[PDB]
């Protein structure tokens, strides 16, 4: 039946971004599966000092943190996506859009991903890196 | 999980031990 | 030991935006044969990548970088593939003493592979916010 | 500039422009 699509950096970035924000919205308790043992995650926050928050590693830690940011009916407008080939056939993705959570206000986000080859299955990738910052928190 | 159908697969096993 | 990614990151970033300001025609020395560079632009859509120093030296000048000031408001770096470092810079950039503009920026840094503590830019993704949130 | 660009890590390659 259907022959496989080539892993075009832009196609991998576009396909991964629709899943990411679809599953964030419809099922954030699953969002931990995009990630691996090694993976790195940070998603806004202003720690006690009032500065941007620290990051965590691996599925369990990431899940922990995802469940702690209670995502209810989280809507996403995505206003641009850039995806480039990076090391070891990995794809680096720059995402700019707005995220409203719990029908609170649509805040603008800057967000870097790195998708890595998964090694076992063709056209399969894992989210090595997930840097998400809100702009109001920084400017 | 029909929407997660695409040309490339990003969804892994759950290392969540229990 | 394997360097600290944020130690490496802040340092590349102060070095990067110093040269951009002082010697922006030397800004290509950060890239290799196969490195992606895209530094904003509407055609009228957001503009495309160019690859390697020679193509990069070009675009760089094709933007008339003059008395280029920057306030870097956040940097975040992390360990990535192959002892590489992904870097996310947020900040304001003024060219030719015109407007001060909010930008998002992503960098991938790869070890040079010869001298330890040497790296090069594999990837460089800049975007003006005013070109996307219109 | 040359003094100012010195740091604990090096990011400057050889100028590959014929």
Author numbering:
A (entry chain B): 0 to 138
B (entry chain D): 4 to 21
C (entry chain A): 4 to 46, 49 to 139
D (entry chain C): 3 to 20
Lines quoted from the article behind this entry:
G3BP1/2 are paralogous proteins that promote stress granule formation in response to cellular stresses, including viral infection. The NTF2L domain harbors the binding site for several types of proteins, including host proteins that regulate SG assembly (e.g., caprin 157 and USP1058) and viral proteins (e.g., non-structural protein 3 [nsP3] of alphaviruses). Most of these interactions occur in a mutually exclusive manner via a common binding pocket in G3BP1/2 NTF2L.
For instance, caprin 1 and USP10 show mutually exclusive binding to NTF2L, with antagonistic effects on SG formation. To determine whether these interactors compete with the N protein for binding to NTF2L, we synthesized three peptides derived from the G3BP1-interacting motifs of caprin 1 (aas 361–381), USP10 (aas 1–25), and nsP3 (aas 449–473) from SFV. The mutually exclusive binding by the N protein and other G3BP1 interactors suggested that these proteins may bind to the same site on NTF2L. However, the primary aa sequences of G3BP1-interacting motifs vary considerably and lack a conserved motif. Similar to SARS-CoV-2 N protein and consistent with published structures, both peptides inserted one phenylalanine (F372 in caprin 1, F10 in USP10) into the same NTF2L pocket. Indeed, after overlaying the structures of all NTF2L-interacting peptides, we found that the side chain of the inserted phenylalanines of different peptides adopted a nearly identical conformation. In caprin 1, USP10, and SFV-nsP3, we observed that aas around the key phenylalanine residue were in close proximity to a side of the NTF2L pocket made up of G3BP1 F33 and surrounding aas. Consistent with our structural predictions, substituting phenylalanines with alanines in caprin 1 (F372A), USP10 (F10A), nsP3 (F451A/F468A), or SARS-CoV-2 N (F17A) abolished their interaction with endogenous G3BP1 in HEK293T cells.
